[PDB]
Amino acid sequence: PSHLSDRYELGEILGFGGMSEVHLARDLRLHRDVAVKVLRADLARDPSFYLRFRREAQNAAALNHPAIVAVYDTGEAETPAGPLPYIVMEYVDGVTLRDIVHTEGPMTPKRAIEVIADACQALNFSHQNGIIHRDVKPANIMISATNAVKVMDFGTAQYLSPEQARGDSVDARSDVYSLGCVLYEVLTGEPPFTGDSPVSVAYQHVREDPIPPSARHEGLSADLDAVVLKALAKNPENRYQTAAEMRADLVRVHN
Amino acid sequence: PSHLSDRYELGEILGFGGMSEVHLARDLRLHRDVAVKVLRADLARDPSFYLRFRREAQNAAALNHPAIVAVYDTGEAETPAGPLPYIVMEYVDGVTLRDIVHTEGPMTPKRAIEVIADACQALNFSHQNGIIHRDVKPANIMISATNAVKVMDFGTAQYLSPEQARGDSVDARSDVYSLGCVLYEVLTGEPPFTGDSPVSVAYQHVREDPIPPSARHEGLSADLDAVVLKALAKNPENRYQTAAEMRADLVRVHN
Numbered sequence: 001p002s003h004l005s006d007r008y009e010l011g012e013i014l015g016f017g018g019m020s021e022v023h024l025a026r027d028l029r030l031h032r033d034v035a036v037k038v039l040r041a042d043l044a045r046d047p048s049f050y051l052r053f054r055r056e057a058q059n060a061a062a063l064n065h066p067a068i069v070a071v072y073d074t075g076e077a078e079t080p081a082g083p084l085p086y087i088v089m090e091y092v093d094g095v096t097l098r099d100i101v102h103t104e105g106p107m108t109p110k111r112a113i114e115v116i117a118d119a120c121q122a123l124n125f126s127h128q129n130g131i132i133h134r135d136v137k138p139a140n141i142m143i144s145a146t147n148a149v150k151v152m153d154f155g156t157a158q159y160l161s162p163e164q165a166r167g168d169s170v171d172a173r174s175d176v177y178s179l180g181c182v183l184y185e186v187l188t189g190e191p192p193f194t195g196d197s198p199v200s201v202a203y204q205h206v207r208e209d210p211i212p213p214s215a216r217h218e219g220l221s222a223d224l225d226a227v228v229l230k231a232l233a234k235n236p237e238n239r240y241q242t243a244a245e246m247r248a249d250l251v252r253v254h255n
Numbered sequence: 256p257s258h259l260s261d262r263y264e265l266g267e268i269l270g271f272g273g274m275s276e277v278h279l280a281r282d283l284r285l286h287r288d289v290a291v292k293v294l295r296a297d298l299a300r301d302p303s304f305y306l307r308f309r310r311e312a313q314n315a316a317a318l319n320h321p322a323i324v325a326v327y328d329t330g331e332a333e334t335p336a337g338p339l340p341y342i343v344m345e346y347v348d349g350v351t352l353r354d355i356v357h358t359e360g361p362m363t364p365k366r367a368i369e370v371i372a373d374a375c376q377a378l379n380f381s382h383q384n385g386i387i388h389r390d391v392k393p394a395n396i397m398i399s400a401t402n403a404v405k406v407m408d409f410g411t412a413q414y415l416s417p418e419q420a421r422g423d424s425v426d427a428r429s430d431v432y433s434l435g436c437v438l439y440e441v442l443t444g445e446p447p448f449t450g451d452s453p454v455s456v457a458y459q460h461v462r463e464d465p466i467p468p469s470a471r472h473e474g475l476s477a478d479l480d481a482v483v484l485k486a487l488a489k490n491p492e493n494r495y496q497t498a499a500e501m502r503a504d505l506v507r508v509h510n
C-alpha cells in the first residue's frame with residue numbers, strides 16, 4: 001500500500017529477500033526518512049512466519065549501539081488482503097561492503113582495519129546482550145554517508161563458520177570466524193574459499209587451510225596475515241574468544 | 256492513563272518540568288524500556304502549546320548521534336479529557352552531571368575532560384544539522400550505566416551565554432560558552448558565577464571576568480584553566496568557534 005497505518009509514505013526498494021522486502025519511507029508524524037521492512041503479505045497469513053517476524057523486531061529492538069542499525073517502531077497495515085506486519089528502522093544512507101568490494105575493489109589495509117575494528121564493537125555488544133548474529137557477510141555491513149560503520153540483520157555458504165557448515169552449535173567465536181572472512185574479502189578482494197558448488201565451499205571451511213592474504217593481494221603486512229588467519233582458525237578454541245579480542249589485535253597492526 | 260495507545264505501560268516519574276512530565280515505560284509491542292515524555296494535558300487543549308510539543312519531537316527526531324538521546328515514536332492517548340500528545344524516546348539508565356556534582360562532588364580532571372569532550376561531539380553534530388541546543392546545563396547531560404555520555408533537551412540563569420543574558424541572537428558559540436560553565440562546574444564543584452538573584456548572575460556573565468579553576472579547586476593544571484577560560488570568553492569571536500575546536504583543545508590537555 002501507499003501509506004502504512006496512514007503515517008509511513010513508502011518509496012524506493014533498497015533491497016529484497018526470501019521473506020521480507022526493505023523500502024525507504026518517510027515517517028509523516030516525525031518528518032524523517034526511515035527504512036521500513038515489510039513481510040511478503042502471503043507469509044503474514046501464517047502463524048509460523050508471523051512469530052518469526054514479530055520476534056525479529058523484538059530481538060533487534062533489544063540492541064541499542066551506534067554500529068547497529070536501530071529499530072524505531074513496529075506495526076500492521078490495514079490492507080483488504082489481511083494484516084501486514086512491518087518494522088520501522090533507522091535509515092542508513094550508504095553502501096554495503098559487498099557493493100564497495102564489487103565496484104571499487106579491495107580497501108586500503110588501514111581503511112579495512114578501521115571498518116572491521118568498528119564491526120567488532122557492534123558484535124561484542126550483541127554478545128554482551130546474549131545475541132549471536134549468525135549471518136556476518138559483506139551484505140550486512142554498510143558504510144554511512146558520514147563514513148560510519150553500520151551492521152544489520154541481527155537475528156550464503158562462503159562466510160559460514162566450520163560449526164555452521166557441520167550443522168553444530170554456534171557462539172561468539174562463530175561470528176569472529178565469519179567476520180574474519182569479511183576482513184579477508186575487503187583486504188584481498190576475494191573470500192577465503194570459492195568453489196563451483198556450496199558443498200565445495202563448506203568442505204574447504206572444514207578441512208582446507210586458508211591461503212595467506214599477502215599471497216593473494218600484494219602489499220599486505222605479515223602482521224595482518226596473523227590476525228586474519230587467527231580469526232580464520234578451524235578450531236574455535238584457537239580463534240579470538242571475543243570480538244573485543246579481535247579489535248585489540250587489529251588496533252595494534254594499525255599502530 | 257495506564258497504557259498510552261494500549262502499547263506503552265507507564266511507570267515511575269524520572270523527572271518533571273513546566274510543560275511536560277518524563278516517565279519510564281515499557282513498549283509492549285517491542286518488549287523494551289523507553290522514556291516517555293507526556294504533555295500536562297491542560298496545555299494539550301491549546302494550539303500554541305500543541306505546536307511547540309509536536310515540533311519539539313520533529314527537531315529531536317532530526318538528530319541521530321550516539322551522544323544524543325533518540326526519539327523512537329510520537330502520538331496521542333485516548334483519554335476522555337482530550338487527546339494527550341506524547342514522545343517515545345531512548346531510555347538512558349543513568350544520572351545527570353547535576354546529580355553527580357551534588358552527591359559525589361567534582362570529577363577527576365581526566366574524567367571531566369572525557370565527559371565534556373564527548374558532549375562537544377553531540378553539540379557539533381547538532382550545529383552541522385543546523386540546530387542550536389539553547390539550554391546546555393548539568394541537568395541535560397547524563398552518564399549511562401555503560402558510562403556513555405548522553406545529551407537531552409535539543410530544542411536557569413547560571414549557564415547562560417552573555418548574548419542570552421543580553422537577550423541577543425544565539426549560535427554554536429552560545430552553546431560553547433554554556434558547555435564551558437558545565438566543564439567549570441564538574442571541575443571545581445561550583446558554577447563560574449553565583450548570586451542571591453538571577454540578575455546578579457546575568458550581570459556577572461556580561462561584565463565580571465571568571466575566577467580561574469586552579470584557584471577555586473586544588474590540583475588543576477594551567478593547561479585546563481586556559482581551555483575553560485577560552486570557552487568562557489565574553490566576546491564570541493574570542494571563544495572556540497565550533498564545539499569540534501573545543502574537543503580538539505581538551506583532547507590535547509588530556510594527552
Ligand SMILES: NS(=O)(=O)c1ccc(-c2ncc(Cl)c(Nc3cc(C4CC4)[nH]n3)n2)s1
Pocket residue numbers: 014015016017021022035036037069089090091092093094095096139152153
Ligand atoms: N536487508 S537487504 O534487503 O539485504 C539490504 C541491503 C542493502 C540495503 C540498503 N541499501 C542502501 C541503503 Cl541507503 C540502505 N539503507 C538502510 C537499510 C536498512 C535496513 C535495516 C533496515 N536501514 N537503512 N539499505 S537493504
Ligand SMILES: NS(=O)(=O)c1ccc(-c2ncc(Cl)c(Nc3cc(C4CC4)[nH]n3)n2)s1
Pocket residue numbers: 269270271272276277290291292324344345346347348349350351394407408
Ligand atoms: N527531562 S527531565 O525531566 O529534566 C529529566 C531529568 C533526569 C532524567 C532522567 N533521570 C534518570 C533516568 Cl534513568 C533517565 N532516563 C531517561 C530520560 C530520558 C529523557 C529524554 C527523555 N531518556 N532516558 N532520565 S529525565
